[PDB]
Amino acid sequence: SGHVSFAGIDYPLLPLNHQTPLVFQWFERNPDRFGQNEIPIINTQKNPYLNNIINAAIIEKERIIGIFVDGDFSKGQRKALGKLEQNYRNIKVIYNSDLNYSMYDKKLTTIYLENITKLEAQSASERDEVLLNGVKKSLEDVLKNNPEETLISSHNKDKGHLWFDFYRNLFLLKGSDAFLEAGKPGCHHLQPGGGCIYLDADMLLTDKLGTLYLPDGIAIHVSRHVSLENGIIAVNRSEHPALIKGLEIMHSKPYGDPYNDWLSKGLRHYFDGSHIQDYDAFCDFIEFKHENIIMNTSSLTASSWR
Ligand SMILES: O=c1ccn([C@@H]2O[C@H](COP(=O)(O)OP(=O)(O)O)[C@@H](O)[C@H]2O)c(=O)[nH]1
Ligand SMILES: [Mn+2]
Ligand SMILES: [Mn+2]
Question: Do 128 and 97 share a structural domain?
Answer without folding.
Answer: no
